[PDB]
RNA sequence: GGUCCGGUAGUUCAGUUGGUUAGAAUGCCUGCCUGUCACGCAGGAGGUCGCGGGUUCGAGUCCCGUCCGGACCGCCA
RNA sequence: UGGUGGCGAUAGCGAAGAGGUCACACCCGUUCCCAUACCGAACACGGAAGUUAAGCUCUUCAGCGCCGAUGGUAGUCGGGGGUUUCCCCCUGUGAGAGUAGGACGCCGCCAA
RNA sequence: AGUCUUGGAGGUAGAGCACUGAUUGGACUAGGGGCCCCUACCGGGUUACCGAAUUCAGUCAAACUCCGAAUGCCAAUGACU
RNA sequence: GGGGCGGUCGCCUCCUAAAAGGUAACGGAGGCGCCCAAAGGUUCCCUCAGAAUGGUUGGAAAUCAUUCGCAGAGUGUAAAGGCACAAGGGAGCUUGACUGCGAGACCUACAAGUCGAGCAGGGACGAAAGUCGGGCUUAGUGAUCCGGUGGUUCCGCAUGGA
């Protein structure tokens, strides 16, 4: 919200001038911020996913969906039909409300921090985070936490190449 | 001794031979080649013997090309048995060679020695042959 | 950018799917709808000869409203196309949603046609 | 295993329909609604 | 003397069914007659010809039969009323 | 030449059926015991399943072929 | 220019370039209809801030894909021979992977 | 019933690689042998000594077919027998 | 391809099969004696396998995000035919996995086997059109006699019952 208004006011004009897009609305934009959860279950502990779901709901703004595994694999003893992982999508005002928490408090609150992954990009503007702890905002009832597994986080943009997204994330406020 | 490392079936019809070869009728990789002017079968032992008769004589002169593969197996019932009651086991691989097919080709070697060496090897094959060279 | 398929492109597949089952013959023509962002079109079509019979639209040259695309416009255009069928009266048609979902302005149009008396 | 079963009804004793079923999947006495001929309408058919 | 062999285990097969078209292009047909006893939708039905439960094609209205290409590769049967 | 069996720790046999776990004696190693050795007492490691191919989420344990041996038959003139 | 049909992709895929007052489409926000096995991108909902960027519509092209007889042949119906697992002659018949080239759209009906 | 004309289904001979397999060479490199050292090879330097994957060329198949006849077969039309 | 021994005996898929159908051999390859209350019916909505790149616990593969991707993936199972306008995948409702039938036609020595529009009675789905008389098509199954069980507006040996 705050960020978004700022996105309308300062970010889009600045980088539109910096790249010379003839059409203004061609400017890159964050499309979605999506969360994935994965629990080594195959089932290892049936309560693991049944805990991760309603901790991730607090972490995000709304309930996730339990991911239905695609195909069976005996390497992990993962039979097809035993649920693993959970997903929640975020967009609209919610994605900016989420990025707000992240950039302002979460990354600086990591057990240790330096500049985020230098070349985590995929190649076409998408970009991913691997954060190991659930310490995202400090008011989680953090004493509840038994397992320490953090989040897999993907930010998806309308960028067509890595350079523009790299530049955009700067004034969005991500360190590198 | 060219084994096909695998095959879809280990038994199939003997088939028939009619007309010229479908492809590979002229030299394509070597300076000179050898051609067969009637239809017949050709087996691992034949190609192996001819190959050795070629290369061991030619020594360091160059390289020899083989355009043949005995993908076809052929069966034979066990010795001393009444015929019938199931196709016999397979014990050899064979390559169909219609007339016009060029079998072997030589590269990087003088003309006369290739001529006489191909003549030498031809006696290993059971088939009337004709010397042939690239256009 | 993220490969977003055209909305009309997606709609065309559904429209072809539904069209596969039915079509409007002589004395049993087919109604049709376009649910454009800014306008709504209606058509009475005879498949076999490949020509329309009568049509109606929000942007027709009379009876306009500031809606021109909302449910009120759908009702008005529906009764309009009912009259446009009436003068060269057919009295029956096979409905064919334009690969849409029968809940909204399409329902308003269908209700208008029914109450006007085009027996589906 | 699949075992044969004949269908029965409470609206009227005369019932005729047959079917198959798995004991493991449906241990409970199953119900279907079907057209009885002699009652000349649809009714709820149990099994015997 | 003699020697023993066996275990062919191949002398079996299904009592094969008949598959083919039994109305000729231009033949007059009567309603309910069979046109093509395919196995799988080898040729789709056109106007006035149905599609049976076992992928069979039968004429709904008595008339004349006609075969014609469907699209690039596929075929289709039709019955044209006389 | 045919039919049937099997092939697992270094040795001998279970499991080999339970498709979803490799086990029991002996041997061997360390320690204790004895003046020393042998018994004996504590502990411990091992094979990853004759070979190759295939089905299956998963093969030791299912189906094929190849090697190995073992059982039976190989008769009428 | 939109809508909606028939035609074998000679209509496709690519590469470039033009358009938008109107039409279309992106867009704006979920207030109530409806919905996201999580969500107003999607479903629907009610507008019209700005944009031809994309879609869509037009101009160009043989890079790919597609279509394509002419004479050849291989095969082959029917006759006739031969030293006959296979070859050859005569009346026809006629392969396809190859080029001659066609093509980067043609026909409609309702609304401008 | 034969023949002439028209229309059909049908995937053989043939041909071919577009699919499924088999399969020969060139280019190329991932990955393996290749010893040295630093040494857990961290990596370099490592033979064409093998060598997957691609692309250029090339050869095969009753259970391969983007193709596909000749004949045979099923009918309609009329014409002669 | 003498008997004995070995093997086989019914059904389903393909090749052998000579471009209709049919066509044998102790010819060449596989499968069946089931399974599914949803893996059926209907309405509605999509779309795959594999690969590359970023992402931790987590690699060759778990679960994510982008791109490529005509079908390599799926279709209960064995092969073939056919299927991305779904016959593949998902959700809601539902039991037509109905009764009486059936113009015609296929296949056929007989016995049987197969499809079938269309009609009536009641439904299920959907606003409607309209679909539904079991699986996406082909196997998953046997005569008659005798006996068991349910309904019977049938007969029941002088008559009424049995």
TrEMBL record, chain A:
<dbReference type="InterPro" id="IPR022803">
    <property type="entry name" value="Ribosomal_uL5_dom_sf"/>
</dbReference>
<keyword id="KW-0820">tRNA-binding</keyword>
<protein>
    <recommendedName>
        <fullName>Large ribosomal subunit protein uL5</fullName>
    </recommendedName>
</protein>
<dbReference type="InterPro" id="IPR031310">
    <property type="entry name" value="Ribosomal_uL5_N"/>
</dbReference>
<dbReference type="InterPro" id="IPR031309">
    <property type="entry name" value="Ribosomal_uL5_C"/>
</dbReference>
<comment type="similarity">
    <text>Belongs to the universal ribosomal protein uL5 family.</text>
</comment>
<comment type="function">
    <text>This is 1 of the proteins that bind and probably mediate the attachment of the 5S RNA into the large ribosomal subunit, where it forms part of the central protuberance. In the 70S ribosome it contacts protein S13 of the 30S subunit (bridge B1b), connecting the 2 subunits; this bridge is implicated in subunit movement. Contacts the P site tRNA; the 5S rRNA and some of its associated proteins might help stabilize positioning of ribosome-bound tRNAs.</text>
</comment>
<dbReference type="GO" id="GO:0005840">
    <property type="term" value="C:ribosome"/>
</dbReference>
<dbReference type="GO" id="GO:0006412">
    <property type="term" value="P:translation"/>
</dbReference>
<dbReference type="GO" id="GO:0019843">
    <property type="term" value="F:rRNA binding"/>
</dbReference>
<dbReference type="InterPro" id="IPR020930">
    <property type="entry name" value="Ribosomal_uL5_bac-type"/>
</dbReference>
<dbReference type="GO" id="GO:0000049">
    <property type="term" value="F:tRNA binding"/>
</dbReference>
From TrEMBL, chain B:
<protein>
    <recommendedName>
        <fullName>Large ribosomal subunit protein uL16</fullName>
    </recommendedName>
</protein>
<dbReference type="GO" id="GO:0022625">
    <property type="term" value="C:cytosolic large ribosomal subunit"/>
</dbReference>
<dbReference type="InterPro" id="IPR000114">
    <property type="entry name" value="Ribosomal_uL16_bact-type"/>
</dbReference>
<keyword id="KW-0694">RNA-binding</keyword>
<comment type="similarity">
    <text>Belongs to the universal ribosomal protein uL16 family.</text>
</comment>
<dbReference type="InterPro" id="IPR020798">
    <property type="entry name" value="Ribosomal_uL16_CS"/>
</dbReference>
<dbReference type="InterPro" id="IPR036920">
    <property type="entry name" value="Ribosomal_uL16_sf"/>
</dbReference>
<dbReference type="InterPro" id="IPR047873">
    <property type="entry name" value="Ribosomal_uL16"/>
</dbReference>
<comment type="subunit">
    <text>Part of the 50S ribosomal subunit.</text>
</comment>
<dbReference type="GO" id="GO:0003735">
    <property type="term" value="F:structural constituent of ribosome"/>
</dbReference>
<dbReference type="GO" id="GO:0000049">
    <property type="term" value="F:tRNA binding"/>
</dbReference>
<dbReference type="GO" id="GO:0006412">
    <property type="term" value="P:translation"/>
</dbReference>
Automatic annotation (TrEMBL), chain C:
<dbReference type="GO" id="GO:0022625">
    <property type="term" value="C:cytosolic large ribosomal subunit"/>
</dbReference>
<keyword id="KW-0699">rRNA-binding</keyword>
<dbReference type="Pfam" id="PF00861">
    <property type="entry name" value="Ribosomal_L18p"/>
</dbReference>
<keyword id="KW-0687">Ribonucleoprotein</keyword>
<keyword id="KW-0689">Ribosomal protein</keyword>
<dbReference type="InterPro" id="IPR005484">
    <property type="entry name" value="Ribosomal_uL18_bac/plant/anim"/>
</dbReference>
<dbReference type="InterPro" id="IPR057268">
    <property type="entry name" value="Ribosomal_L18"/>
</dbReference>
<dbReference type="InterPro" id="IPR004389">
    <property type="entry name" value="Ribosomal_uL18_bac-type"/>
</dbReference>
<comment type="subunit">
    <text>Part of the 50S ribosomal subunit; part of the 5S rRNA/L5/L18/L25 subcomplex. Contacts the 5S and 23S rRNAs.</text>
</comment>
<dbReference type="GO" id="GO:0003735">
    <property type="term" value="F:structural constituent of ribosome"/>
</dbReference>
<keyword id="KW-0694">RNA-binding</keyword>
<dbReference type="GO" id="GO:0008097">
    <property type="term" value="F:5S rRNA binding"/>
</dbReference>
From TrEMBL, chain D:
<keyword id="KW-0689">Ribosomal protein</keyword>
<dbReference type="InterPro" id="IPR001705">
    <property type="entry name" value="Ribosomal_bL33"/>
</dbReference>
<dbReference type="InterPro" id="IPR011332">
    <property type="entry name" value="Ribosomal_zn-bd"/>
</dbReference>
<dbReference type="GO" id="GO:0005737">
    <property type="term" value="C:cytoplasm"/>
</dbReference>
<dbReference type="GO" id="GO:0006412">
    <property type="term" value="P:translation"/>
</dbReference>
<dbReference type="InterPro" id="IPR018264">
    <property type="entry name" value="Ribosomal_bL33_CS"/>
</dbReference>
<dbReference type="GO" id="GO:1990904">
    <property type="term" value="C:ribonucleoprotein complex"/>
</dbReference>
<feature type="region of interest" description="Disordered">
    <location>
        <begin position="20"/>
        <end position="48"/>
    </location>
</feature>
<protein>
    <recommendedName>
        <fullName>Large ribosomal subunit protein bL33</fullName>
    </recommendedName>
</protein>
<comment type="similarity">
    <text>Belongs to the bacterial ribosomal protein bL33 family.</text>
</comment>
<feature type="compositionally biased region" description="Basic and acidic residues">
    <location>
        <begin position="25"/>
        <end position="48"/>
    </location>
</feature>
<dbReference type="Pfam" id="PF00471">
    <property type="entry name" value="Ribosomal_L33"/>
</dbReference>
């Amino acid at each position: 919200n705050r960020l978004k208004e700022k996105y309308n006011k300062e970010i889009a004009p600045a980088l539109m001038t910096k790249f010379n897009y003839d059409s203004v609305m061609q400017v890159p934009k964050i499309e979605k911020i999506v969360i994935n959860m994965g629990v080594g279950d195959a089932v290892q502990n049936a309560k693991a996913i049944d805990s991760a779901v309603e901790e991730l709901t607090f972490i995000a703004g709304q309930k996730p969906v339990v991911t239905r595994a695609k195909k069976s694999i005996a390497g992990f003893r993962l039979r097809e039909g035993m649920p693993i992982g959970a997903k929640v999508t975020l967009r609209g005002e919610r994605m900016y409300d989420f990025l707000d928490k992240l950039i302002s408090v979460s990354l600086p609150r990591v057990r240790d921090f330096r500049g985020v992954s230098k070349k985590s990009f995929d190649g076409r503007g998408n970009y991913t985070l691997g954060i190991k702890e659930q310490l995202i905002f400090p008011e989680i009832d953090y004493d509840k936490v038994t397992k320490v597994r953090g989040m897999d986080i993907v930010i998806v943009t309308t960028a067509n190449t890595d350079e523009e997204a790299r530049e955009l994330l700067t004034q969005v406020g991500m360190p590198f | 001794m060219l084994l096909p490392k695998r095959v879809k079936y280990r038994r199939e019809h003997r088939g028939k031979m009619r007309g010229r070869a479908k492809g590979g009728t002229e030299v394509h990789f070597g300076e000179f080649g050898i051609q067969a002017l009637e239809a017949s079968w050709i087996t691992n032992r034949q190609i192996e013997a001819a190959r050795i008769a070629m290369t061991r004589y030619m020594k360091r002169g160059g390289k020899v090309w083989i355009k043949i593969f005995p993908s076809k197996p052929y069966t034979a019932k066990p010795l001393e048995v009444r015929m019938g009651s199931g196709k016999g086991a397979p014990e050899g691989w064979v390559a169909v060679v219609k007339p016009g097919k060029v079998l072997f080709e030589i590269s990087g070697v003088s003309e006369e020695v290739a001529r006489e060496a191909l003549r030498l090897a031809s006696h290993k094959l059971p088939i009337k042959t004709k010397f042939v060279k690239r256009e | 950018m993220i490969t977003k398929t055209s909305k009309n492109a997606a709609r065309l597949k559904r429209h072809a799917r539904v069209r596969a089952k039915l079509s409007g013959t002589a004395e049993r023509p087919r109604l049709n709808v376009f649910r454009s962002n800014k306008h709504i079109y209606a058509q009475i079509i005879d498949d076999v000869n490949g020509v329309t019979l009568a049509s109606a639209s929000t942007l027709d040259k009379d009876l306009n409203v500031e809606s021109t695309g909302d449910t009120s416009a759908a009702t008005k255009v529906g009764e309009l196309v009912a009259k446009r069928a009436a003068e060269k009266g057919i009295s029956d048609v096979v409905f064919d949603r334009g690969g849409y979902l029968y809940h909204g302005r399409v329902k308003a149009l269908a209700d208008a046609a029914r109450e006007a008396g085009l027996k589906f | 295993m699949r075992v044969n079963i004949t269908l029965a009804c409470t609206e009227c004793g005369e019932r005729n329909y047959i079917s198959k079923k798995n004991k493991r999947n449906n241990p409970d006495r199953v119900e279907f609604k079907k057209y009885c001929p002699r009652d000349k309408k649809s009714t709820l058919h149990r099994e015997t | 003397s003699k020697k023993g062999v066996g275990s062919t285990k191949n002398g079996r097969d299904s009592e094969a069914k008949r598959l083919g078209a039994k109305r000729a292009d231009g033949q007059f047909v009567t309603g309910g007659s069979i046109l093509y006893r395919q196995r799988g939708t080898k040729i789709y039905p056109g106007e006035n010809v149905g599609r049976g439960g076992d992928d069979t094609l039968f004429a709904k209205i008595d008339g004349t039969v006609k075969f014609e290409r469907f699209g690039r590769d596929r075929k289709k049967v039709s019955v044209y009323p006389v």
